[PDB]
Design a protein around this ligand. Structure first.
Ligand SMILES: Cc1ccc(C[C@@H](CO)Nc2ncnc3[nH]ccc23)cc1
Ligand SMILES: [Cl-]
Length: 167
């Protein structure tokens, strides 16, 4: 039993809800919140910009030190950093950004990072400003993640299409 509330159950382990991941994380304070990161951990917009704003830019400060030490992530890769005031940990995961021409096949590799954590609050990878079809992203999530994932979809219209079109 966990403290996630109001989710629709899609499969044994995947759940989905219309919610602002920022507000969800503050309420639940999950062990792991997933960020829709880029390889440079520059959290300028989208989910990443919103999560960083909620940390008063502490996420960005920590991220800049991470990059200065380790260099950029790989597309499809991840790193674990602090969750600041939002969660215990933040798993920064880089899905392909279609608006950069990045290979959509890497979306499965991106979701594989979730399997290293028993329970996660997450957005749909490569959705929003990363340019991929959120319906496809949900399919890859369900077919790749085996741990317990709570998917937060900010847009109410998009959420209804995801559910009503889910197979
Ligand atoms: C119309 C539309 C907008 C955005 C998306 C992508 C989605 C991640 O896939 N973004 C988010 N998901 C959950 N909480 C969030 N808080 C801030 C951003 C955000 C798809 C479609
Ligand atoms: Cl977005």
């Amino acid at each position: 039993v966990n403290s996630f509330s109001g989710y629709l159950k899609l499969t044994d382990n995947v759940y989905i809800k219309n919610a602002d991941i920022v507000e969800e994380a503050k309420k639940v304070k999950p062990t792991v919140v997933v960020n829709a990161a880029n390889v440079y951990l520059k959290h300028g917009g989208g989910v990443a910009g919103a999560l960083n704003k909620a940390t008063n830019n502490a996420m960005q400060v920590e991220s800049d030190d991470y990059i200065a030490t380790n260099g950029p992530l790989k597309v499809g890769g991840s790193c674990v950093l602090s969750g600041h005031n939002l969660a215990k940990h933040c798993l920064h995961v880089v899905g392909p950004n279609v608006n950069k021409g990045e290979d959509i096949q890497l979306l499965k590799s991106a979701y594989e990072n979730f399997n290293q954590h028993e329970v996660l609050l997450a957005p749909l990878l490569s959705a929003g400003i990363f340019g991929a079809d959120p319906i496809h992203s949900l399919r890859v999530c369900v077919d790749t993640v085996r741990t317990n994932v709570y998917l937060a979809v900010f847009d109410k219209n998009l959420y209804d299409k995801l559910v009503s079109s889910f197979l």
